[PDB]
Paper text:
The FAD synthetase from Corynebacterium ammoniagenes (CaFADS) is a bifunctional enzyme responsible for the synthesis of flavin mononucleotide (FMN) and flavin adenine dinucleotide (FAD) cofactors. The C-terminal module catalyzes FMN synthesis from riboflavin (RF) (riboflavin kinase, RFK), while the N-terminal one transforms FMN into FAD (FMN:adenylyltransferase, FMNAT). Bioinformatic tools for the exploration of macromolecular interfaces predict that CaFADS might stabilize in hexameric assemblies in solution, organized as dimer of trimers. In the predicted CaFADS dimer of trimers model, the protomers adopt a head-to-tail organization within each trimer that causes the RFK and FMNAT catalytic sites of two neighboring protomers 6 to be in proximity.
The overall structures of F206W, D298E and E301A CaFADSs are quite similar to that of the WT (A chains r.m.s.d. values 0.149, 0.152 and 0.251 Å, superimposing 274, 309 and 317 atoms, respectively). No differences were observed in the D298E CaFADS structure relative to that of WT. Replacement of D298 with Glu allows carboxylic oxygen atoms to maintain their bond with T165 of the neighboring protomer in the trimer. D298 replacement by Ala would prevent this interaction, but in the D298E mutant, the introduced Glu can still retain it. However, the presence of more than one orientation of carboxylic oxygens suggests that alterations to the FMNAT ligand-binding cavity within the dimer of trimers is a factor that determines the low flavin occupancy in the FMNAT sites of these variants.
Author numbering:
A (entry chain A), B (entry chain A), C (entry chain A), D (entry chain B), E (entry chain B), F (entry chain B): 1 to 258, 263 to 338
The structure:
Amino acid sequence: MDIWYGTAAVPKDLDNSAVTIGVFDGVHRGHQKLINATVEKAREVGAKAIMVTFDPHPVSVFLPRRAPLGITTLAERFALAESFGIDGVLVIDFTRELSGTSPEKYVEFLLEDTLHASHVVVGANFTFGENAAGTADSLRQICQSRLTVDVIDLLDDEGVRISSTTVREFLSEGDVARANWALGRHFYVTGPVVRGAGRGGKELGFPTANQYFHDTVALPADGVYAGWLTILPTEAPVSGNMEPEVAYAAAISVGTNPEQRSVESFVLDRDADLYGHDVKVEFVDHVRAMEKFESVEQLLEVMAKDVQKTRTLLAQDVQAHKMAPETYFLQAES
Amino acid sequence: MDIWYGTAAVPKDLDNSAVTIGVFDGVHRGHQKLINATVEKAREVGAKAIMVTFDPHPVSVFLPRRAPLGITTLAERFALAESFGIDGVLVIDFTRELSGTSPEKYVEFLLEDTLHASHVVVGANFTFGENAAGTADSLRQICQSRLTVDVIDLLDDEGVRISSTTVREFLSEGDVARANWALGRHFYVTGPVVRGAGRGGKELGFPTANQYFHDTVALPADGVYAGWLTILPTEAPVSGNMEPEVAYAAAISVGTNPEQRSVESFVLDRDADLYGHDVKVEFVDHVRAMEKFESVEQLLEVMAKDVQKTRTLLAQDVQAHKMAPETYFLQAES
Amino acid sequence: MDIWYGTAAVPKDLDNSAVTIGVFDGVHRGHQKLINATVEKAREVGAKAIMVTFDPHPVSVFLPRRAPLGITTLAERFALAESFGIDGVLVIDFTRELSGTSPEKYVEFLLEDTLHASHVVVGANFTFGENAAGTADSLRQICQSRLTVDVIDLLDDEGVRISSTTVREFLSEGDVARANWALGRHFYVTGPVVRGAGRGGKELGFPTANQYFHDTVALPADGVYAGWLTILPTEAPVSGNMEPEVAYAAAISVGTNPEQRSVESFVLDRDADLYGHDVKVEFVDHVRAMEKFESVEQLLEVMAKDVQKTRTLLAQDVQAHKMAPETYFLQAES
Amino acid sequence: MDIWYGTAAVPKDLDNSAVTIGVFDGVHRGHQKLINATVEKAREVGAKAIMVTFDPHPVSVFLPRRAPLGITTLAERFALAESFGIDGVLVIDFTRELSGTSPEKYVEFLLEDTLHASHVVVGANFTFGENAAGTADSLRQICQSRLTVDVIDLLDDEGVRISSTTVREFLSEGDVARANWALGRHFYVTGPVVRGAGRGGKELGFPTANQYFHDTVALPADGVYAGWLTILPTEAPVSGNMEPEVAYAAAISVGTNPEQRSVESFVLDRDADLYGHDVKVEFVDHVRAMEKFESVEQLLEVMAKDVQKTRTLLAQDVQAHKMAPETYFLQAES
Amino acid sequence: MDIWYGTAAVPKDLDNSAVTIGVFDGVHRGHQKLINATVEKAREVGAKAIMVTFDPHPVSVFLPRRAPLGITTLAERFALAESFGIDGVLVIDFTRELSGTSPEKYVEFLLEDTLHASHVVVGANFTFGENAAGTADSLRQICQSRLTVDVIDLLDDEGVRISSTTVREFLSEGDVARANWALGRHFYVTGPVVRGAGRGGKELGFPTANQYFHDTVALPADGVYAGWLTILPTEAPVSGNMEPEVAYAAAISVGTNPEQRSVESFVLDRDADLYGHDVKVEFVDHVRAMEKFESVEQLLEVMAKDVQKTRTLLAQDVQAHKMAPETYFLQAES
Amino acid sequence: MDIWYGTAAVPKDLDNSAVTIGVFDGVHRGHQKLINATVEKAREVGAKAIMVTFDPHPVSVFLPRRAPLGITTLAERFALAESFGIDGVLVIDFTRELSGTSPEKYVEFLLEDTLHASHVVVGANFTFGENAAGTADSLRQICQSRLTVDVIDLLDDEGVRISSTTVREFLSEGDVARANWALGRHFYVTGPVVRGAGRGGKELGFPTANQYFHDTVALPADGVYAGWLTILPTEAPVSGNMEPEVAYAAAISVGTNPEQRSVESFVLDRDADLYGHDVKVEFVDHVRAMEKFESVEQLLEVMAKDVQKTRTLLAQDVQAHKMAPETYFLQAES
């Protein structure tokens, strides 16, 4: 998949495309409709399926540092776009271009001159151009007889509107299961493992992995979650009895160092230290709220209840195998 | 108007004065009673009307950094004192002098030796001298046959005691209208315009002006307010279609960068960038509470409702012309 | 009293001991049971009474910076241990040793090899060894026919379980009286006096002493407390009319500089400045919640009510003379 | 003079302009040559004289926070431009536009479509377009018979090349005399006066005014300088015996702070406190390097030598006429 | 290769090992001698080759934050060890164990009980046990007829002693060529690429990749260097025309930040943005010292000289064969 | 000895005093001359000997945070004054009083009204009153026949002028021997011992005590020094084999911290941890400059040389008798 930053970087010889336009933060189930419609039409005409997206978040252009929390990093937005068969991602920076353009010169410049588009696919809520004057309705009439438009209704399911906003709310409430349901996959973060408390290994109280994320990263509410930890492919040696590319059962503790988030993972039935490695943490279900511990005894007692509840939640998760990982490790007991 | 810092700076040849004593933070309607009484008596005897005030706030002497928020800066206290016809302001620093003095030596030193006072005017709540032993009652009997005293009852109106404290509470609640009612004018701050998001001009989402204030500055609760923005007199060139000394209709957004306050002003129907200029923001009425925005579309939709509600509130404000500005700019519509 | 850091520092020739094991934070009334039982048995056999304790807090080993607030500093834990007749304190660092040891090798290494113990005394809640597998029950059966064990029931009194946790809760609620009741003495902190507002002396609004404590120090909730201030023995000159080693009546103001705590002490009926000195502040009873002051007058009015209420509370405290100080200064009135 | 941010802000109905392009930082004597040729030409054909300038500094686009120090602020660059009769300033942001654009498109878009120039004036060192390929030569050969092009050589005078760089070097070494000579005026900074040491007035040791400047502001080397301070036009009252709009002889002390630079002005033969005013400080000549003081006596002794030496240097500046202030205040002796 | 944290993590069923002990920071050519003798011996008797190394650095145990800069991270020390065929790394923490232990007990516990070594290999400068009393001699005389001991002299080559220290000195002066020569390979750092100036692509001035490193990471002196950048194996898409697993000719700019070090790579003849990838940067030769830029033209001029000089130096590196990358990309001209 | 803050704190019933006025920072041998003449005179006429001193430093009143480093704290200045038999210290704050006061009023108010002095003793360099106009001469001519005035010349000895300044210079260069010689005693700092590297005891490399000092505290140049450490009188238990009130031979390492200065004491031939105690550290002689260590072996090697060299230098200090501690502990060899 090609990734272009700004219209100037798009090749001039690109002859045909089917284009979809949005922030696509989270690539949730609504976003997948747009991507699917786009990829299908591109196959039909032998064109490329292009996603036009935005970075920085268009909101932070007008209101710096008051933009919505990023459900996925931009890099993951790329990976997700690819996984649903997008051929090229054009990334637009509204501080550089396409902000003050009229709806008319936007269609002309972006969809025609730059992308040589024959089809465009947007959500009913899509807007564009100076002061957001261009709507889904504008696009259909500016494009009349120039390129076909397909406006897709916002996705409603089980009485919930599926959007970046609702995914953020579920995450913020700690309801990862509903977030997962809306995303169409386990919500996950990825990151390098740093040193934490003591060492990963024989001791149950020491995390198998510690990770840190900047405050622009959307994360579940502080608490303990059941989920899966996967060491991303690597040739570097791993300390302990975990193998790369296998999804291990884990009780996951999300915290805050006072506004900057930690993820501390206790991998079930494994003695490992993952320092140095890049690790994916998939969230499955909420286990408990954060609590302060009065003693080592009380701490480990609770840690053991976490493990128990996680084993139950994950044994269930594996049965919904469309969202479960391919290769996993979960023991029936300790 | 003369401004003296400490008794030592008051000229020795000053022969007669009518004196009023207080913090006078905000110069609210109660303060105006004292200033009026003082100026009138000074006219009568051909004396100077002197305000003795305090800086730092007397509270912060005993309790550093736990003093009340300053309704006006000291500089504005000066400007306000002048506007009601005070001839000289003596500013007292209790860390330098007049703290450990008995009520007796206070009257002797300040009112007689320093100010050559024939009349003094205080509020019923006025205190002075070591451990605040001197009251309004003390002053009348220490001054018996030495200078005339006039003790003015605290101002009650519409069931509200008008004081610095109540003005702070209204400000803190976001009720600028009641604060304004108590102040006898639109509450305002002044400050240099810095760079903010993008540039002031054609784009509605970009503030016409961004300002920052330290946390000792009393400001309305975070939210959006209707008010008026005035470029203070200047010869420096102005970017866009705003003229100096004219009060422009503006939706004002008060925020916090996390405890340090921003004021972001969206001037109605004008394309301007006020970087470099000194700007006065007058607050008129509360419009809405702060909210987080999920998209550019939702942001501008709300921005447009702000403008609408501001136009209404300001069209009303102009009709109460004792508080409205002399020269204003407000359009009937977009 | 000897103080040893780590098993390596314990003398090899130590021939017999009676040992008690715990964090002992606060040395509350429950802790005193264990210490008393231990000292009594050590007297019987002509052995040394040894306390094994822990530093850092065992919780912070697994969960850095999320450990319980220290009721006493370690230094005070030493002083308290001594005051109840402990002969030696062994301080264990779980990052250095005794964490991954089995219950068996723990008893062998610590109690036998290191301490040459003939008696051990623990609380019913005591645990030890890898993943806290060793309980009070384990200890009795590992030690069968090797050394006598005495497991003491947790102390319940007046429907309250007396523990570090409950003492922290009372402190956190501002209920020092109940904390005191649980500790078996007035809760106190000690620390050097720094410069604060103005100078200690004639002025009532200026603290006699200002102190600062790091955020790991357990302190009562912000507010004003009645208590006693004692200048710890010194040959250094004291400014004003306070003598060392005498416990002076004081209204104590606990605050926060924003999470880092201040203690500002207003010594009743004394003009003193305690800069430079080491000072103990004993807390007796809660007086009022913190409040913001609108004027010097209101501030001193409230300060005077504090003094009044403190005089009452302390006059009562002196009558419970088991917790009252030996030599005190309290005037009947101003 | 108008100020436009980006090509899109430029009036579309602009028929004819004389244009000069450059950073113009400092508006030094070399820059004046460009502006003069442009302005004299503009009042030739009866068109508008336009400056195209850049903010942020083009170097900072590539090396953020490693651009050269601003000789003047952008605000002052505007004011200086206007003083030399520029009719409009167009401000280009290279992060936004005109960056990746080829030399060919740059001339067409900026000079033709946007500005409709009949005449352009650049320095022989002018470079533009993608990868700075376009040079002074490119400009003459791309403007074929459409707009006339006048290329001015860099200014050499007294063996010294006059550039923003050489001005920065002079400033940096503390040679304000040579900086001024290259600038064609006294180097100055402008800023609000804040609080500092004590209060301005009778005491020689307390500054008349304190100002702080960010690390992006070019200032002379740490030390003491002869200069003039002017209170910018204002109706706000002045504490002490200074008028606005008069340049007052001052010894000026420039210090640093572990950003952040301070300017402390000791105004000669005046007792005043300038808190709250906007104040322009002009540098004339270096007096001495910074030094630490061991006693009050030494500081006051040296302070008196600073005044004597300032008195002399400023006398010379008045007689050299050329750069002196129109209205000033300077006593021959104390 | 296995990785064990502490003696307790070592498999208890380990019957036979060949062991080498040392910090091994950098795994330089002197270190390779130790590893080779150990590995060749291990595949002799058919046992495991073990490295005993130390983290944190033993110097930091005594002088926290004053230990020598890490030539490689511990992660890289593992990878290098594995590359030279070490079967297990055992990592000792001196705060935890083997510190206060006498020479006698150190050999028994570590080499015998834990590792069951038949053979140990140390550098002649090896010291161990309490107060570093145990030396290369102690080791031969304490291992009497149990395990054979091979002491290797420090490596001298071309008159230079090869040590972690001499490598650090070379790095520190910017002599990466000599550092590499002592290391036996190109010195490298590895890290995630983050955002920086603009976006990687068409523009020469914007880096292909930006990386930041803590102050504990040894880096060459501030300046520009010839090197190779490699995108570490990944299935994540690459923006622009680079493959993973190919070393690309790059000019490398190493800067500082008032920790904290930056590495900015300008990849030759490629338009790419490497945001989000893990990237290995190899240093070959110094090009020039850091310098400030006065204009875009100068920066681009110098940038082009950096490319020419890199092009040459890298050609020499390819032909010198020995340290060149297996798969690389380098154009002869632009 | 009494301590009074401000003229108002001085007893009103003071009939007769002998007074000395000065900063007295360090109470060096020149200062002792002043105190001696004052004290010998006070026990002459049978009056009180009074020191008038200043806090904050008068230079800091004018140049905040740019005053000279305090040779001793104000606490220590009090203690030293008392040791030389001063009966009362009166501490003047120049921000509060005696600043703008003319020479005439200064003598009347301070020396007469406040202190009722029959005799005053100043250094020939003494200056006072507004703008330091009043000199040693002014004092003799303003005290006409009321109080006798004894002016003492600055102390010259061995060609060196003894002043706070020359002491600071000696300290700053690391020449504590010359500082001590000018002071008349071992320069010392006093402070609570906190935690540092490991724990004090058996290991040579871990300091017996760690102390930190603000940047306002004069300390010898970064490096290692011979000195004596004394545990200040206490009933708190000592961990290890040190008594309070004995000076113990120590090698002293003074470091810096990107304020903030550290003092790490390695007590010779003692295994102890002094956490929590107040500790006085005396400097005798410089041993070496600071250096970085490459290995544990090197650090311990150098540490042993520090001990040998300290052992020698301290032997000389004991025999030179004059400045040695009364009770000390120093072994001839290890």
